[PDB]
Amino acid sequence: PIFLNVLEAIEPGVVCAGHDNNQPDSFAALLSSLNELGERQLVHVVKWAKALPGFRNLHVDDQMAVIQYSWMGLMVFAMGWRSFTNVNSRMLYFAPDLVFNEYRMHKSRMYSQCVRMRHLSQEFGWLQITPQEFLCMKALLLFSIIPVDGLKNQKFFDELRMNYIKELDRIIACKRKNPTSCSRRFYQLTKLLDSVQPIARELHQFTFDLLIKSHMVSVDFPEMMAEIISVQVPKILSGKVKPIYFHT
Numbered sequence: 649p650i651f652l653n654v655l656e657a658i659e660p661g662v663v664c665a666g667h668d669n670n671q672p673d674s675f676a677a678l679l680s681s682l683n684e685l686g687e688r689q690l691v692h693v694v695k696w697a698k699a700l701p702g703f704r705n706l707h708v709d710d711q712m713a714v715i716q717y718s719w720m721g722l723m724v725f726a727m728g729w730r731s732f733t734n735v736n737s738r739m740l741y742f743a744p745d746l747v748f749n750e751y752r753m754h755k756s757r758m759y760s761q762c763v764r765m766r767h768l769s770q771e772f773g774w775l776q777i778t779p780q781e782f783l784c785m786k787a788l789l790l791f792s793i794i795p796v797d798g799l800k801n802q803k804f805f806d807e808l809r810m811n812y813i814k815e816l817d818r819i820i821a822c823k824r825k826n827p828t829s830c831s832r833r834f835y836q837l838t839k840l841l842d843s844v845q846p847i848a849r850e851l852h853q854f855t856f857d858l859l860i861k862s863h864m865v866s867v868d869f870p871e872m873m874a875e876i877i878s879v880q881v882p883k884i885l886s887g888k889v890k891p892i893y894f895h896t
């Protein structure tokens with residue numbers, strides 16, 4: 649109960665975008681709001697991550713890198729859950745003041761990615777994902793993308809990741825488990841976790857392209873964002889840093 653206790657305890661609260669729901673759904677205004685929300689979420693993900701059990705075990709530089717690389721996916725996963733819980737996956741609940749309907753999914757020019765995120769969101773329902781399974785999975789997501797040539801202290805990372813996999817196994821396996829149930833459950837969740845990496849890559853590519861042409865579409869990028877997108881995101885896109893997949 650100690651592990652789960654801290655996961656619930658450190659879970660971020662409601663984060664609003666500050667979007668003007670009175671202005672028209674322009675690509676510019678929507679994306680400017682997603683960016684600002686992205687920044688706000690980054691702030692919370694950093695304080696959240698740093699308060700995770702064993703996170704301080706990681707070397708100093710590995711700490712921020714692991715957060716910056718996995719940030720997009722962490723936002724994807726949590727947002728999918730928010731969508732499931734609040735609107736039954738009908739729309740994408742980015743924030744209480746920024747809910748995407750089909751019109752907004754289209755106006756943002758991110759329809760394809762939105763569509764995939766809505767699918768992931770639906771998976772929480774189909775799979776009957778537990779609020780506890782969700783928390784553990786989100787935590788594991790933090791340690792799911794690293795430089796192909798390793799970190800400053802890979803050994804500490806590997807141990808940290810190993811322990812979080814075990815916690816998941818512990819949660820998704822405390823009841824009479826065996827056959828199509830114990831491993832059935834684990835396979836389902838690991839497959840679900842892998843499914844977030846392709847969404848994050850698509851989002852990374854899209855965000856990168858948008859930053860590059862930002863002054864041409866009147867889309868505003870916050871400081872921390874422009875930096876992460878221009879410094880860490882290209883490493884993922886060029887293959888230097890890659891997701892850790894369970895399958896295939």
Ligand SMILES: N#Cc1ccc(N2C(=O)[C@@H]3[C@H](O)CCN3C2=O)c2ccccc12
Nearest residue numbers: 682683685686689723724727742851855
């Ligand atoms: N909660 C929240 C939240 C906030 C911003 C984004 N998000 C980004 O960081 C990037 C840039 O804004 C352009 C495309 N994009 C996004 O949609 C999210 C993506 C997926 C899930 C949640 C997101």
